[PDB]
Design an enzyme around this catalytic site. Structure first.
Site, PDB file in Angstrom:
ATOM      1  N   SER A 183       3.787  -1.955  10.644  1.00 37.10           N
ATOM      2  CA  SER A 183       2.372  -1.893  10.948  1.00 37.10           C
ATOM      3  C   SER A 183       1.534  -2.097   9.697  1.00 37.10           C
ATOM      4  O   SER A 183       2.049  -2.357   8.611  1.00 37.10           O
ATOM      5  CB  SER A 183       2.031  -0.527  11.550  1.00 37.10           C
ATOM      6  OG  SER A 183       2.089   0.498  10.568  1.00 37.10           O
TER       7      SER A 183
ATOM      8  N   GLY B 205      -3.117  -1.640   3.654  1.00 37.85           N
ATOM      9  CA  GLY B 205      -1.916  -2.432   3.422  1.00 37.85           C
ATOM     10  C   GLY B 205      -0.945  -2.518   4.572  1.00 37.85           C
ATOM     11  O   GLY B 205      -1.243  -2.112   5.693  1.00 37.85           O
TER      12      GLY B 205
ATOM     13  N   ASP C  93      -9.351  12.499   5.312  1.00 44.39           N
ATOM     14  CA  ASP C  93      -9.120  11.510   6.373  1.00 44.39           C
ATOM     15  C   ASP C  93      -7.976  11.955   7.273  1.00 44.39           C
ATOM     16  O   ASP C  93      -7.133  11.145   7.674  1.00 44.39           O
ATOM     17  CB  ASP C  93      -8.950  10.077   5.858  1.00 44.39           C
ATOM     18  CG  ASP C  93      -9.162   9.002   6.912  1.00 44.39           C
ATOM     19  OD1 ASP C  93      -9.802   9.296   7.944  1.00 44.39           O
ATOM     20  OD2 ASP C  93      -8.678   7.865   6.708  1.00 44.39           O
TER      21      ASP C  93
HETATM   22  C1  LIG Z   1      -2.919   2.185  11.890  1.00 48.90           C
HETATM   23  S1  LIG Z   1      -3.133   3.915  11.416  1.00 48.90           S
HETATM   24  O1  LIG Z   1      -4.268   3.942  10.428  1.00 48.90           O
HETATM   25  C2  LIG Z   1      -1.632   4.144  10.482  1.00 48.90           C
HETATM   26  C3  LIG Z   1      -1.792   4.744   9.244  1.00 48.90           C
HETATM   27  C4  LIG Z   1      -0.686   4.965   8.438  1.00 48.90           C
HETATM   28  C5  LIG Z   1       0.583   4.578   8.899  1.00 48.90           C
HETATM   29  C6  LIG Z   1       1.723   4.814   8.015  1.00 48.90           C
HETATM   30  N1  LIG Z   1       1.617   4.864   6.699  1.00 48.90           N
HETATM   31  C7  LIG Z   1       2.877   5.094   6.195  1.00 48.90           C
HETATM   32  C8  LIG Z   1       3.021   5.183   4.723  1.00 48.90           C
HETATM   33  C9  LIG Z   1       4.117   4.560   4.103  1.00 48.90           C
HETATM   34  C10 LIG Z   1       4.253   4.626   2.707  1.00 48.90           C
HETATM   35  C11 LIG Z   1       3.298   5.299   1.962  1.00 48.90           C
HETATM   36  F1  LIG Z   1       3.459   5.345   0.617  1.00 48.90           F
HETATM   37  C12 LIG Z   1       2.203   5.916   2.537  1.00 48.90           C
HETATM   38  C13 LIG Z   1       2.049   5.859   3.939  1.00 48.90           C
HETATM   39  C14 LIG Z   1       3.756   5.166   7.276  1.00 48.90           C
HETATM   40  C15 LIG Z   1       5.207   5.386   7.379  1.00 48.90           C
HETATM   41  C16 LIG Z   1       5.902   6.192   6.463  1.00 48.90           C
HETATM   42  C17 LIG Z   1       7.280   6.335   6.657  1.00 48.90           C
HETATM   43  N2  LIG Z   1       7.944   5.729   7.685  1.00 48.90           N
HETATM   44  C18 LIG Z   1       7.263   4.959   8.553  1.00 48.90           C
HETATM   45  C19 LIG Z   1       5.885   4.752   8.447  1.00 48.90           C
HETATM   46  N3  LIG Z   1       3.003   4.984   8.416  1.00 48.90           N
HETATM   47  C20 LIG Z   1       0.750   3.966  10.153  1.00 48.90           C
HETATM   48  C21 LIG Z   1      -0.379   3.749  10.959  1.00 48.90           C
END
Ligand SMILES: C[S@](=O)c1ccc(-c2nc(-c3ccc(F)cc3)c(-c3ccncc3)[nH]2)cc1
Ligand SMILES: C[S@@](=O)c1ccc(-c2nc(-c3ccc(F)cc3)c(-c3ccncc3)[nH]2)cc1
Lengths: 279, 274
Positions: A20, A25, A135
């Site tokens: 996603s 990012g 947030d």
């Molecule tokens: C679209 S909504 O705003 C949204 C925001 C953040 C994330 C989202 N952000 C992360 C994520 C990954 C790495 C980072 F360093 C910080 C956040 C993950 C994640 C982390 C570990 N495994 C699977 C997914 N998912 C997904 C959807």
């Protein structure tokens, strides 16, 4: 005692696949070729370079049981990304609103989720200096392999989790240690209801007006039935958190002390059954 | 450099400090953080050499942070008290899961293989550090089990059945020896060298190239992946350190085995323990 964050060569990540969009990012899943674990990679100007390095610094310093664990940083001429543990079961939002995929979400798990979000945000507030989320939303409350909470995207667009005094931000609202509890109060309402806050309302602009007036999501039999464990204590906690006056709002520590007995009324086994039910 | 400092926890913030057991260095107690609102574990000796030994363990834990290593929460460094604060592991150790057969009559195969996979992932991460951090005291008693029966390794980089014969006198081939014995023990749920009265009789037997019994009684023919597992065990505990696999090879062997188990099988192996 200092621990440096490992630096991961991009070429060490294999099986890179899109998942996603994140906060800012792309979020991809991959595997570490040497560590033999599945990982998540958040990847994207030398200005935006210090931006990725800032999130990585925050995740690394904010390390705790309910905060997304960071594994290392990719910092190369060709690629910039943050490498964390892989969260297999999406976010709170998808567990709450994907009703065909999840017809039942047992009370033990729901309250465990609420308790872990509070334990997470509270840890940020108790850091030195206090770390503010600002947030906190259901979309960034991540669920691990056994549906335990990992909070992400803190200290870095759905307005439903925003306190009204942040609608037109000042230096006071951006430094407010009572923003997160308003978000938590909306999440608590949403978790216990499995309803989208202000569903009836058409414009997100319209929501902002009623929210600034005084209106909050509905606290009635339809949204929050009487069959809800500890309903009175819960409804008290929600209304207390989404209080129009930031000063009238409780700390996460106060809510925790109120939640500790609530969670103890659930037999250890019921949490495990709730998880098996989602599989 | 992205540095993070290990938090300093004031001894007054550690409430309900109630004894648990002993540990390599000193005493293990359970407690609760006053502000963080979580259950924790504290490791303290019950003197300047002892103080430098404690802070070295905490520096190792904070530097060896990974998904299968006991997560350190902070250091309690005061004149009144000196202790290492870590997450609380509510399910004992691998030793207790294996040998407390009254409490655990059935420990399903999916979980046993997951446990072996995670010990290897933990030790492999250490060996992959810069510089490689060698465990050298891998045993069932310090392979801890968290809330979800996942592994957290402790007492690394600091009982004689897990020790390679050449160590009776820092090789990267020690840990795989220990790992091979642990694998034998996980799959058999039997005490290695059952008949032996003196630990010296084990030490003698091992130095003479003898190992825990691989037969139908110790390892029933219906054990999943028996041929593969025996081969990994037998290579792992080879008299020649150089004939023993790296943890990478050991993990490449285990990966096809773990793919045969769906996530639910792990969840229902754990519910069966409850
Ligand atoms: C679209 S909504 O705003 C949204 C925001 C953040 C994330 C989202 N952000 C992360 C994520 C990954 C790495 C980072 F360093 C910080 C956040 C993950 C994640 C982390 C570990 N495994 C699977 C997914 N998912 C997904 C959807
Ligand atoms: C049976 S003996 O070999 C033995 C060795 C280590 C331990 C043992 N050591 C620890 C422990 C605690 C803090 C540390 F910093 C390091 C180790 C734990 C622990 C950690 C978290 N929650 C519960 C218990 N258990 C217990 C028995």
């Amino acid at each position: 005692i200092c621990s440096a964050l490992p630096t991961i060569p991009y070429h060490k990540l294999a099986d890179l696949r899109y998942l996603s969009r994140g906060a800012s990012g792309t979020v991809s899943s991959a595997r570490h070729a040497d560590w033999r674990v599945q990982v998540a990679v958040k990847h994207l100007l030398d200005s935006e370079r210090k931006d990725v390095l800032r999130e990585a610094e925050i995740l690394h310093k904010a390390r705790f049981s309910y905060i997304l664990p960071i594994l290392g940083i990719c910092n190369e001429p060709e690629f910039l990304g943050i490498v964390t543990e892989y969260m297999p079961n999406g976010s709170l939002n998808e567990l709450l609103h994907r009703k065909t995929e999840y017809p039942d979400v047992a009370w033990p798990l729901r309250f465990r989720i609420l308790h872990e979000i509070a334990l997470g945000v509270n840890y940020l507030h108790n850091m030195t200096p206090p770390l503010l989320h600002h947030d906190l939303k259901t979309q960034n409350i991540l669920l691990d392999n056994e549906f335990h909470v990992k909070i992400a995207d803190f200290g870095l667009g759905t307005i439903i989790y925003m306190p009204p005094e942040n609608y037109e931000p000042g230096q006071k609202s951006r430094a407010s240690i009572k923003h997160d509890i308003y978000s938590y109060a909306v999440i608590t309402w949403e978790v216990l209801s499995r309803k989208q806050p202000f569903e009836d309302v058409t414009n997100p602009l319209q929501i902002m007006y009623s929210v600034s007036q005084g209106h909050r999501p509905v606290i009635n039999e339809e949204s929050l039935p009487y069959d809800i464990p500890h309903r009175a204590r819960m409804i008290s906690l929600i209304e207390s958190g989404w209080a129009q006056n930031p000063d009238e709002r409780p700390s996460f520590l106060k809510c925790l002390i109120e939640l500790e007995p609530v969670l103890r009324t659930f037999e250890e086994i019921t949490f495990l059954e709730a998880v098996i039910q989602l599989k």
